[PDB]
């Protein structure tokens, strides 16, 4: 709490500015060669693109102006830009450019090849307590950083946790994020990581985040996640009851952390407590972990992926290809003047 407070404040400012002044138009579609579709969205597509000049692949999220309105996702779609545009941190995915064209919007991040976590996890089976720790140590620092900027994250999961050439992580998709102060009431995110506040809908807060950190971990360490059924409503009652079963192989300090996070009471849940993050940051489980090396990305990674070369999409899925349409007249240029 010496060096780890000069930052946060130093870091809260840097951000503020950007926050409060976002470059917009920074490129045009043509500067890029569309290579391949990476991930999806009900309001866009994330695909692989090669920058003409600098043979640098990036990754282009492209939301269609007309699909984001039917879901008013505007309010949102605008801060994801404003955030990535101001947010700044190692474990955060870099935004390089943002432009819009007649029809749909574009955010162009750095390309994290290694592939999304959710998959290695399913491939491998589960993670070894350390392995999981390696990651967690990265979320904790991450949410420490964020939370300090009045930014709940709202959408933590393995599909958002991408893996770089050095097994470290970068979280993508700030599409649910929200700079706030106090309570907010939006029901957003996968039913599986839903803190039980959200479920009743009684204005949650950053606390819902730390809760997802547990679900994160549990699952990282078990494969399966704590709460899970077939159909959503079911998973719902499950969560509120809060009866969690630990697999036999859980370390003891694993099972400790957990039930502190997976705490159906905010007013008694690490992350929400008066000692703040230091409750977690100090939990035995993190005994060995050196909070700087990680940070400083000086630590040697447990895992890795093999990249055949620059812009290798092996670690990724195969989706159906589509075009990048651009009707002839500025469709929906009203609501997106900020973009």
Swiss-Prot record:
Allosterically activated by various compounds, including ATP. Activated by cAMP; the nucleotide acts as a dynamic and allosteric activator by coupling the two lobes of apo PKA, enhancing the enzyme dynamics synchronously and priming it for catalysis. Residues 32-286 form the Protein kinase domain. Autophosphorylated; phosphorylation is enhanced by vitamin K(2). Phosphorylated on threonine and serine residues. Phosphorylation on Thr-186 is required for full activity. Phosphorylated at Tyr-319 by activated receptor tyrosine kinases EGFR and PDGFR; this increases catalytic efficiency. Changing residue 186 to D: No phosphorylation by PDPK1. It comes from Mus musculus (Mouse). One of its GO terms (biological process) is mRNA processing. This is cAMP-dependent protein kinase catalytic subunit alpha. Changing residue 76 to Q: Does not affect interaction with SMO. It is a lipid-anchor. GO terms for molecular function: ATP binding; cAMP-dependent protein kinase activity; magnesium ion binding; manganese ion binding; protein domain specific binding; protein kinase A regulatory subunit binding; protein kinase activity; protein kinase binding. InterPro entries: AGC-kinase_C, Kinase-like_dom_sf, Prot_kinase_dom, Protein_kinase_ATP_BS, Ser/Thr_kinase_AS, STKc_PKA. The active site is at residue 155. The lineage of its organism: Eukaryota, Metazoa, Chordata, Craniata, Vertebrata. Phosphorylates a large number of substrates in the cytoplasm and the nucleus. Phosphorylates CDC25B, ABL1, NFKB1, CLDN3, PSMC5/RPT6, PJA2, RYR2, RORA, SOX9 and VASP. Regulates the abundance of compartmentalized pools of its regulatory subunits through phosphorylation of PJA2 which binds and ubiquitinates these subunits, leading to their subsequent proteolysis. RORA is activated by phosphorylation. Required for glucose-mediated adipogenic differentiation increase and osteogenic differentiation inhibition from osteoblasts. Involved in chondrogenesis by mediating phosphorylation of SOX9. The modification Phosphotyrosine is found at residue 319. The keyword ATP-binding applies. Pfam families: Pkinase. Coiled coil: none annotated.
